[PDB]
Amino acid sequence: XXXXXXXXXXXXXXXXXXXXXXXXXXXXXXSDIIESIFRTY
Amino acid sequence: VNVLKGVLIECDPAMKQFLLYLDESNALGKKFIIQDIDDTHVFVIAELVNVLQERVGELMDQNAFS
Amino acid sequence: XXXXXXXXXXXXXXXXXXXXXXXXXXXXXXXXXXXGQVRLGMMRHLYVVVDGSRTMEDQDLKPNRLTCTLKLLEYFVEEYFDQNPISQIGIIVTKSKRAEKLTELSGNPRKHITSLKKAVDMTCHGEPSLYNSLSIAMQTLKHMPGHTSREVLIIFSSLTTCDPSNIYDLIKTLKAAKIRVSVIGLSAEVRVCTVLARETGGTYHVILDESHYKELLTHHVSPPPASSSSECSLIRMGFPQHTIXXXXXXXXXXXXXXXXXXXXXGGYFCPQCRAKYCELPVECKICGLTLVSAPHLARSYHHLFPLDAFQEIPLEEYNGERFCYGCQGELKDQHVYVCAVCQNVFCVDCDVFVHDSLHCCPGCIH
Amino acid sequence: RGLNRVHLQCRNLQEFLGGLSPGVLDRLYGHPATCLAVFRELPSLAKNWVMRMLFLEQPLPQAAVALWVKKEFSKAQEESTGLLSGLRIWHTQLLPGGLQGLILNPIFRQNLRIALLGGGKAWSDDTSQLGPDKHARDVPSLDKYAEERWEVVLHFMVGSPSAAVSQDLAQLLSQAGLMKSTEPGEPPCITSAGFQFLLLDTPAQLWYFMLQYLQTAQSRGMDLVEILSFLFQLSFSTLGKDYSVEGMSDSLLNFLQHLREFGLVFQRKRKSRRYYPTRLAINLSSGVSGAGGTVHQPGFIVVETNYRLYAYTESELQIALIALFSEMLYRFPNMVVAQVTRESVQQAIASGITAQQIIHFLRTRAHPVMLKQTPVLPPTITDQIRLWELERDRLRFTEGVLYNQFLSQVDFELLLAHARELGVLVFENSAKRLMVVTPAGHSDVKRFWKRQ
Amino acid sequence: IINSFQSIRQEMEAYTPKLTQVLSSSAASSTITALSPGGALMQXXXXXXX
Amino acid sequence: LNLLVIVVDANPIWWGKQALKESQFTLSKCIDAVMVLGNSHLFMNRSNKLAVIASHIQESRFLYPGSKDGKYELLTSANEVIVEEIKDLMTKSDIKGQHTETLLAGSLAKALCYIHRMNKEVKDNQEMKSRILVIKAAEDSALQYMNFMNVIFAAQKQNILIDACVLDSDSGLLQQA
Ligand SMILES: [Zn+2]
Ligand SMILES: [Zn+2]
Ligand SMILES: [Zn+2]
């Protein structure tokens, strides 16, 4: 249907799942986090 | 050629050279080992084989004490 | 911290025996089985949705919940294909807010149990998604024909049911798409699974033990009765005879297979398309016919002319027939079981054997 | 002990009956008890083949016997055919071309058919009429009598103050190689064969009694044939129904009262006309009592991973046996607590016990909580027992004769080839010409050297 | 029904020959001839020539 | 440890027509071949067990369950009880008209539950394998097919093998089983 027939909704801790680090100011590359921020805010 | 009717002794090489050591010390009465016919096998005078049967196990247990 | 005081004594010689017998009798229980002379859904595309949540890794069971759940699903696939041959199973692990069709809807236990032996080794990361799992199960179960009681079994553990959309429009759709969803729950009662179960048509249950969870999966093995909604059609069926290599392969038809195969000399044909199948029963891969050997209709005839109850009486009670009519043995216990129609005599071993396996009274045949 | 040590080998009724005279065998099958008793010993292939060919008067060719078996099993097939042939069941006849016909020995075949169907003899059962007998004996009291008498013999071997053996049986124990009398003012000792006899199963012990009893049956005017027919007549009898004696010779009376001394048969009086075949006499069979449990007595030794034996049985005999292969710490009126020390097993092999006796002893008396394990013993303990016996048994002795320092090398392989020719080769050399031949078979090659 | 009930009530009164009646040996020889691989009940089957 | 359960289709109408045929082969040699097979099975090993059932037209009565003439003793007692049981069964008999074709589903049901209880008798050391011989000589009624498949699937689950010697006529349900 789609990539997963939908996406992963922002459950909670979309800022604190792998917080500020795709390893503060660390790397930022996690797909769930950027898509959940794109939906959420 | 030189027909000797000794007794074959089959072991593992550790006890083979333990028998060689024990025969060099002459702890069963005579130089009871004739020659060394293999990497494994030994020859022994037939009548000291019973004192061998006791004292080899007894002296191996005595070597692990000092 | 003082459980040691649970052992009392009156004469202390058989009184410790009485306390041990009370404990050993209170550590066991009997099942609750229901009978019905009602329509059942006998062609049955069931579709199993397992959690792969974070709460699958919790150790409430003796191994973690993933391992016990998966072991009883291996037993479930075994007994369901042992009892309903026409039907099919498909397995979705629901993991990380997304749903994954782990094993497609097929009708042989080898692929499913192989996939469960694989799925022991998984990770169980993230929160589940009931939306996407019911969406994949709906997407496959739209276009099965209308006489199939299309059923989903959600073995569901966690509490945060992290959907990506609204899951009351799914329940309205699945209400209109005449599917039936039943949820077996772990550790709690969740309102959304309760609404889903009571509205789609299914049944919701929560788990105490190993034994209670086995009783629930055994309850979902049997074909559940139909609503006033499901279509009562007449599916066209095919009954292919077995065909060996005709007369020492005198003008045979050497084929490979039809779903790493060798050279098939003979076997099962199809009466619609004249293809080559090794195993029967198999839905026709290129026609849409369903192929039946017809003991596979006779393997599930006991649901239609079912058993009755045994009149259970423990006491001595007028028994002029001392021996078991089942297997010709004495009744050395105080449980005597007497049938309804013939009213012969049976013991406990004949009770469990007749009501679980043989599925008929030996008296009423005579 | 310049030979090898006394390894107690049970014959299992094949090496006994295979190795006799065929006239003795053709007399031996003259009672249906012996035909059933040799029948049940057979492997299952030979079993089914005798029951196939039983109702038949024609010598079937060799092709059908080789052609009754699927292809994969020919390695496990020729043993059954050869065992039927050597035991004088299949005597070979000829179809009138060249097909070697095979036919069952009509004495053996006729008496098996008497064992299955009606017969012309009467199994030596008799009763004039004697009803409920004066002091009729009860079945658990027959069990008690068996336990009492055979444990008295076992205590006599152990050397208790319960030495109720009546000195013909002690002479039998000295004659079979078990209790050696030395310095004849009456110490009866135990040979190492006696220690290996103790740790054995009860049907294996009784059948070893009957084998070494009939090994010296040339002494008291005994014949092997009638005694073995009476043994196989005992072990195919029933505890309940009662027998009579009328129809037996006087040497049979002497053997039956000697057998009463064994405890295998409960008499009432010496001049009586009745015997009760005891529960020891029925389970007389060349076989194994089990690996987890015994029909005689349920197992009682719990062997935990602590090398820890929990014996739930009060008996001075079995306490002495557990004292043989272990060392014992606690004794309660229900239980004995023992520990299997390395030094305890090394004492149990200094007196001479190969530790398959020990492991099978513990498997025989395995307690019913120790069951429901598929390896009924903990394999750490069992493999440790085997490693202890392999530390104790590290010398292998052989009397030989030396050939050393030959003058050439062609005569080296010539002497080696003549040794291989007459089957007297023992050990060879490749480099330094150091050969070992059999010393008893050396004089052949020695006189060959004086002939070249 | 009545004829067969009469004949089998008369039949199962006198009973048990065990040595004599059961097998003639020629029938057993013909049975071994049949179950040999070139006779009846050995259908020349399980060939499957590929 | 093995368990042969012979089932002999004692149709009195069929063997009555066979005994009025004045052939060589009557019911006496049938039940005698049954007993020689039974004594052979008990004879092959000490631990073997035997049970012999006789399907009559209206009842599944079991047949089974010193040495005067030279047999082994328990073989003699088993042969005596099988002989006396068929003499009590077939001679003292009845006559009805609506139900005259023989049955096989009920005797197989008794055999299945008998093997169940005798497998509960087995202790943990040993394990019982089992089979059911069916010696059929009559024509099976079609009317119990609904029943008959069920006992086959019970023998499918309980891992009991089924063998069949049919005497006169082929039988599709029994070769099916
Ligand atoms: Zn098709
Ligand atoms: Zn009934
Ligand atoms: Zn019963």
PDB file of C-alpha atoms in Angstrom, chain C residues 3-27:
ATOM      1  CA  UNK C   3       4.148 -19.121  54.643  1.00  0.00           C
ATOM      2  CA  UNK C   4       5.639 -22.020  56.660  1.00  0.00           C
ATOM      3  CA  UNK C   5       2.585 -21.833  58.953  1.00  0.00           C
ATOM      4  CA  UNK C   6       0.336 -23.111  56.153  1.00  0.00           C
ATOM      5  CA  UNK C   7       0.860 -26.750  57.250  1.00  0.00           C
ATOM      6  CA  UNK C   8      -1.504 -27.803  60.036  1.00  0.00           C
ATOM      7  CA  UNK C   9      -1.884 -31.147  61.782  1.00  0.00           C
ATOM      8  CA  UNK C  10      -4.684 -32.825  63.754  1.00  0.00           C
ATOM      9  CA  UNK C  11      -3.410 -36.404  64.027  1.00  0.00           C
ATOM     10  CA  UNK C  12      -0.252 -35.383  62.048  1.00  0.00           C
ATOM     11  CA  UNK C  13       0.117 -38.827  60.443  1.00  0.00           C
ATOM     12  CA  UNK C  14      -2.552 -38.460  57.772  1.00  0.00           C
ATOM     13  CA  UNK C  15      -3.172 -34.784  58.566  1.00  0.00           C
ATOM     14  CA  UNK C  16      -0.056 -33.631  56.735  1.00  0.00           C
ATOM     15  CA  UNK C  17      -1.352 -35.934  53.995  1.00  0.00           C
ATOM     16  CA  UNK C  18      -4.688 -34.091  54.158  1.00  0.00           C
ATOM     17  CA  UNK C  19      -2.970 -30.701  53.894  1.00  0.00           C
ATOM     18  CA  UNK C  20      -0.820 -31.921  50.988  1.00  0.00           C
ATOM     19  CA  UNK C  21      -3.897 -33.434  49.313  1.00  0.00           C
ATOM     20  CA  UNK C  22      -5.850 -30.196  49.753  1.00  0.00           C
ATOM     21  CA  UNK C  23      -2.962 -28.237  48.210  1.00  0.00           C
ATOM     22  CA  UNK C  24      -2.480 -30.705  45.336  1.00  0.00           C
ATOM     23  CA  UNK C  25      -6.234 -30.695  44.667  1.00  0.00           C
ATOM     24  CA  UNK C  26      -6.336 -26.892  44.773  1.00  0.00           C
ATOM     25  CA  UNK C  27      -3.482 -26.748  42.239  1.00  0.00           C
TER      26      UNK C  27
END
